[PDB]
Each structure stands twice: as structure tokens, then as C-alpha cells.
Amino acid sequence: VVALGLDFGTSGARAIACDFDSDRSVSVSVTFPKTSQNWPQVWREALWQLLTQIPADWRSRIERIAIDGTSGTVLLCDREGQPQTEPLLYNQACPIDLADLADWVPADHAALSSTSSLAKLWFWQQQFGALPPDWQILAQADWLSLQLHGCSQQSDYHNALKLGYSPDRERFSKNLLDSELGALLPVVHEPGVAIGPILPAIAQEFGLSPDCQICAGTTDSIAAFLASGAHQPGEAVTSLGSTIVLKLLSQVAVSDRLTGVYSHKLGGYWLTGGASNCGGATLRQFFPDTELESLSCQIDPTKKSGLDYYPLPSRGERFPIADPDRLPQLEPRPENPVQFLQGLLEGLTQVETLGYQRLQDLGATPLKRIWTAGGGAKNAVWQQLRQQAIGVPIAIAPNTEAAFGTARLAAFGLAAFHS
Ligand SMILES: Nc1ncnc2c1ncn2[C@@H]1O[C@H](COP(=O)(O)OP(=O)(O)NP(=O)(O)O)[C@@H](O)[C@H]1O
């Protein structure tokens, strides 16, 4: 099958069209502006740009399309999907009383945060006073796929989670549904399932098959996990970027209030994980990348540095163990920078080790292996430290592009995530 994955991320958008029987693909990109007074227009026009940059040869063969977008980026729209106010982005928080939400979701639900879609919907309820029942709240992914299939009030259970959806019982609460916010809530499908065929006009315009299907979308983080291809419980993806982000495939849902850990449903499985404040930014505080390569190649990982660092960039850890007063420990400082770097790397290694072990201690399926992404993935000394301390096979993820994970989502859905 020839499938299209569309990735709308934090700084840009990428389209990856894949023929999965000949292992062939084309990838195009668009970079977002630094500022805009009409972000919906930016996104939509980026969509048309991406479609346009895909060769006519491919567009005619594409049978399924899916879209991932940033989590917590929502739009308030009329019944035709026309934005009625500025979007609230993923990074923006809302000044409200999370106790106003407790009667709508279970205790410690992931939607109980000032940056969640539900908090933003409530914020809009307060700001507008009363929201017209024919209106709708749509995640970025939702709104963009709506541009293709014309079916309003449609979302997926990845995006809908922080809007107050409960993927364990697969529903919004009756309280929330019967509230004044209920009428703006979307119908929630599984990521990957066909919502409807592409619009006739859109198909004509862009030389797409009028029989092409638009699927339910997902978030860019989950899409990144999908890029790896991991589908057995116990498999994980570690992102060694500016911050270390762990994602672990589990047979069981796990969560933790104080560390903010939660789980998304993923087929018959669950994707859990957590994000540390430690990461590559700490490394950046002492070495540029070139120095990281040159010095890391001088490290022998089979000899302990003697150093026991907690490589926070600044004060306060969020995961594996919450502690808003945790200070960076980088003492004592050896005079050899090779040894200092080794100490830092051992520290970050301990962060990943503790993180995964903690996820398991909360009930998650025991770790089977690690696929690695992000800036530190290529560092084989760091990788060695990690395999020593964790004790599972570790490799570089076969693919890490969110658009590719989304193309896989379009082509195969979540079928692989079942026993
Ligand atoms: N050889 C290396 N070994 C270890 N860390 C490295 C190396 N090269 C770069 N880094 C770190 O990689 C970090 C950048 O990670 P990168 O993933 O590319 O960016 P990002 O901001 O995290 N965006 P994302 O890819 O979504 O996580 C920087 O802080 C670098 O210090």
C-alpha cells in the first residue's frame, strides 16, 4: 500500500509518502514562521504546500493519509471548522483552577494540567462565558485532517486523552459529556482507522485518488515512537536529545502523580514513559558537539570514572524522581575533560536506567530492548555505558521521523499492537 504521513511539529511540517511493498519513499518539508497572526492559515497552507511538493506520480498512487500534530495545540471552531479565536498552542498554559476539572475526569487524570486541551477548553468557556453547542474544539491533527475529509468533531484517542478522554474505558465521562462542554467534544476513533474518503475537490485539485482514505491521526511524540517500528511489550525508544525522553511499550497502563507519568492506549497495548530534566543541554553547557565527539572517543566505558554525577542543567528534577529542589551534582571536577565528560555520560546513563526501572516498578512490562533516537544516539561510548548499566540490547532506531511513523500509521494502523 502507498501511504502518506503528515507531521506537524514544533517548528515545521514534513510529508513522507511511502510505498511499503517496494520500500520506496519521498520526503518533503516546510519550515514554520517564527511569528504569525494567523497560525491556522499557516498550518493549512503548509498542508497544501506539502501536498504540492509531492510528485504527481506519488499523489496518484496514495491510498491512505494520516496526520500527527503537537499535543495540546487546540482550536475553537464553528460547526464548519472556522477558528473563532487564536489557537492555544502546546506550550501555552492557562491560569485556572484545576479543581474545576476534578468532577469531569478521574483522580490524577492526565488532563489535569494547565497546558492540557481540557484546561484550554475550560479557559475558553470562562473567556467566552458561554460556548455555542454547535461549536467544536479540535486538536491541530484533528483540524488538519478535517481539511481533507470534511467530517467535523472527529479526533483520536491519543489526542483526546488530555482533553479528558479515558482510553481504558474508551469514553469521556458522563459528567463531562452532560456538562456545557460536552457538545464541543469530538467523536473519538482509534488512530489509523479510516474516518472517511478524501474530499472530491481536494482529490481533483491535487491529483489524488478520489478513493483515498483519510485516517484518524495522533500526536508527534507517539508518531516518533511509531517510526521505530517497535510493537512488542517491553520494547522502548530512548530519545537522547536536549532532554532525555523515555517511551516504553507495556501490556499494562502505568501512571504516577508526582512525576507526571501517564500512559496512552496503543491498540491492545499501552505506551508509557517519562521525561527527565537531564539531557544533552547539560552536555552543551560544557562542550559543543565537535568536542563531544573528539572527547567521547577517548573514553573507556569499562573503567568507572569514580564520579557520581546527577547531570541536571539546573535546579529541579521532574523524572524519574520528582524533587523541585534537586541541584546539579557535578562534583568533584576532574582536571581531565575526558574524565569529566565520562562522568556526565555515566550520570545521564543513570538517569535512563533509573527511569526505565522506575517505569517497571510502577507496573510496566519489563524492558526487552532499547531503540535510540536524538542527538546522543550516535554516541557509541554512551551507548556502551547504557547497555552495561541497563542490561538489554540497545541499538539506533531504524527510523525516527514522526512523518514516517505517521505513514506507517496510515498504512497499517495499530494492528501490530495486539497479542
Ligand atoms: N556525540 C554526541 N554525544 C552526545 N550528545 C550529543 C552528541 N552530539 C550532540 N549531542 C547533544 O544532542 C543535543 C541535541 O539533541 P537533538 O535531539 O538533536 O535536539 P533536540 O533539541 O533535543 N530536538 P529533538 O530531536 O526533538 O529531541 C544537544 O544538547 C547536544 O549536546
Swiss-Prot record:
Enzyme Commission code(s) on record: 2.7.1.47
GO molecular function terms noted in the UniProt entry: ATP binding; D-ribulokinase activity; D-xylulokinase activity
InterPro entries named in the record: ATPase_NBD, FGGY_C
Coiled coil: none
Cofactor(s) this protein cannot do without: a divalent metal cation
Amino acids binding substrate: D7, S11, G12, A13, R14, S71, D220
Organism, as annotated: Synechococcus elongatus (strain ATCC 33912 / PCC 7942 / FACHB-805)
Reaction catalyzed: D-ribulose + ATP = D-ribulose 5-phosphate + ADP + H(+)
A GO biological process held by the record: xylulose metabolic process
Protein keywords: ATP-binding, Kinase, Nucleotide-binding, Transferase
Effect listed in the UniProt record for changing T10A: Reduced ATP hydrolysis in the presence of D-ribulose
Pfam families: FGGY_C
Gene3D superfamilies: 3.30.420.40
Annotated family: Belongs to the FGGY kinase family.
Protein name (Swiss-Prot/TrEMBL): D-ribulose kinase
GO CC annotation, single: cytosol
Annotated residues for binding of ATP: S242, G280, G375, G376, A377, K378, N379
Function: Exhibits ATP hydrolysis without substrate. Phosphorylates D-ribulose.
